[PDB]
């Protein structure tokens, strides 16, 4: 299809994966597991489950950002996720291994709930996918609900399990566009 | 060739280049999504070539680069178009209206997605025709 006789549309697609050594990238695989590459080896898993993995209502965050950064880049990524959520509670550990946090979606029926907040942030950092369990109306930015009660964010040992979607840099960059 | 991207930077593609007019236009024009991606590609390239170390992806370095290189509004507008069921672009693909004899490539436009699927040249017919007129005007 040539416009004005001579103009063709080429369509180029980017190797977003090429950026893995300088900036985090987000890819969704199946409907319960989504993740962030945090390099050419190490990753970060985001799981949608109904399992109470973390019962540590009191999270032992003392020295979390100071004495032992298992992965300082990773702790920074996890912290920005939290910080971009508007307004409430979380359970977590991060002592030794178990470098993870659990967000519980709990509500007694309106928009602007705690669940809506975590889901918006989650969706944005996993944007370009994450339409899964997108239980929301059109344009209703603050009415987004999901099917699962828990979101667990935890350290992984791999960079390569990407199918279904593409490891886009947009998610993390958007997360921090404050 | 302006900023040429190799087969290791483009997905399932060989190396691609374009005339310098387009890079000059990228640097002068504002709110073009592909320009932010180019800045990230060059940033990545240099960051590793200079670093030469396992101490990769320092978050503080990338955050500062992002503040310097990335337009936060392009990201937010695109996310709001998504919530509003308005076609929006992810950055995997771009449209490159290109003159086939001169190799004159326009600034890449992003390729909008509707209900999880790409829109046709039909949907972009107006944008395509307008860019073709602009390319002619600039060439003359």
């Amino acid at each position: 299809s040539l416009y004005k006789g001579v103009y063709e549309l080429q369509t180029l697609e980017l190797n977003m994966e090429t950026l893995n050594m300088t900036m985090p990238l987000s890819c969704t695989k199946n409907n319960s597991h989504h993740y962030i590459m945090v390099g050419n080896e190490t990753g970060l898993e985001l799981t949608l489950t109904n399992t109470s993995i973390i019962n540590h209502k009191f999270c032992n965050l003392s020295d979390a950002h100071k004495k032992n950064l298992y992965d300082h880049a990773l702790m920074s990524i996890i912290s920005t996720f939290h910080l971009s959520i508007p307004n409430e509670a979380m359970s977590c550990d991060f002592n030794g291994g178990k470098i993870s946090v659990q967000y519980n979606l709990s509500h007694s029926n309106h928009c602007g709930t705690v669940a809506n907040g975590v889901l918006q942030t989650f969706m944005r950092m996993a944007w370009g996918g994450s339409y899964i369990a997108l239980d929301s109306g059109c344009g209703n930015w603050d009415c987004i609900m999901t099917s699962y009660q828990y979101l667990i964010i935890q350290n992984t040992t791999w960079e390569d399990h990407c199918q279904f979607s593409r490891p886009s840099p947009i998610g993390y960059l958007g997360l921090l566009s404050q | 060739g302006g900023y040429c991207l190799t087969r290791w930077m483009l997905i399932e593609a060989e190396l691609k280049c374009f005339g310098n007019t387009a890079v000059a236009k990228c640097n002068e024009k504002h709110d073009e999504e592909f320009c932010d991606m180019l800045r990230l590609f060059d940033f990545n390239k240099q960051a590793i070539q200079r670093l030469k170390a396992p101490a990769q992806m320092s978050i503080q370095l990338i955050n500062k680069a992002v503040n310097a290189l990335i337009n936060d509004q392009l990201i937010m507008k695109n996310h709001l178009r998504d919530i509003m069921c308005i076609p929006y672009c992810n950055y995997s693909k771009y449209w490159y209206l290109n003159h086939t004899t001169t190799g004159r490539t326009s600034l890449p436009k992003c390729w909008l997605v509707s209900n999880g699927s790409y829109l046709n040249e039909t949907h972009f017919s107006d944008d395509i025709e307008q860019q073709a007129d602009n390319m002619i005007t600039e060439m003359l």
Epitope: N31, Y131, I132, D135, S136, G137, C138, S147 | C85, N115
Partner: antibody, heavy 122, light 107 residues
Framework: QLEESGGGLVQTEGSLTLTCTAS?????????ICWVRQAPGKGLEWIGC???????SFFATWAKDRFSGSKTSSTTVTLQGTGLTAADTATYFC???????????????????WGPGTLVIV | VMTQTPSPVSAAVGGTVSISCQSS????????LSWYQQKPGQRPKLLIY???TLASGVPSRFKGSGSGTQFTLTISDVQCDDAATYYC???????????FGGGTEVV
């Protein structure tokens, strides 16, 4: 409950509008009205579905060529079919739904109340 | 697309009958589900839904389970009065128009 009307025999190369009426529970603007058919002796298939805030099509790839949209009053919903043929003979049913998930990616999960079926012969 | 256990199904009164369904693609969410039955001449009755929950007071005898693409149904202490054509439903709209099974006849 859900009550049916508008059934009976029609001629081929024709049209027929089927009707479902709300009883007790009036209709909201949500996707709470949905329709299916089955030829006698055959299993059930989807014809289309109904959302009341704005006219939505929701038709089966098959159904969409002969099945038009609907009127959605607070108690009465009307389904217009056109270009009907003998093969369209079936018992038709109005079902209340909480079935549709509403993000752009629409999903089918949990039908609830069924109306009596109505027999339509073409 | 959905498939189902063969149509010529029967059982003695008491005990169980084996009923099953399978999709071509995993369901959007494995906790989405609808099992129902139709006695001839009757409108459909929902039995089991979502994460194998019983609907509307139907007998506790109705059981089922599954995930992904494959789910099952069985009914304890089957009665002659449970004879019905048994069905599965659910699916994604983009994936299929058939969101109902064909039906298996259970005597």
């Amino acid at each position: 409950q859900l009550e049916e009307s508008g059934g009976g025999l029609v001629q081929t190369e024709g049209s027929l509008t089927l009707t479902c009426t709300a009883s007790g529970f009036s209709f909201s603007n949500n996707d709470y009205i949905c329709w299916v058919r089955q030829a006698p002796g055959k299993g059930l298939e989807w014809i289309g579905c109904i959302y009341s805030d704005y006219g939505f099509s929701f038709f089966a790839t098959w159904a969409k060529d002969r099945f038009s949209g609907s009127k959605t009053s607070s108690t009465t919903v009307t389904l217009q079919g056109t270009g009907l043929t003998a093969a369209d003979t079936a018992t038709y049913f109005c079902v209340k739904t909480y079935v549709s998930r509403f993000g752009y990616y629409i999903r089918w999960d949990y039908f609830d109340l069924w109306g009596p079926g109505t027999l339509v012969i073409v | 697309v959905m498939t189902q256990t063969p149509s010529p199904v029967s059982a003695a009164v008491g005990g169980t009958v084996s009923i099953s369904c399978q999709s071509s693609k995993s369901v959007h969410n494995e906790n989405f589900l609808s099992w129902y039955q139709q006695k001839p001449g009757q409108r459909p009755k929902l039995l089991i839904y979502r994460a194998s929950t019983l609907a509307s007071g139907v007998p506790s005898r109705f059981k089922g389970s599954g995930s992904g693409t494959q789910f099952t149904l069985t009914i304890s202490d089957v009665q002659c009065d449970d004879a019905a054509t048994y069905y599965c439903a659910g699916g994604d709209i983009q994936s299929s128009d058939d969101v109902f099974g064909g039906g298996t006849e259970v005597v």
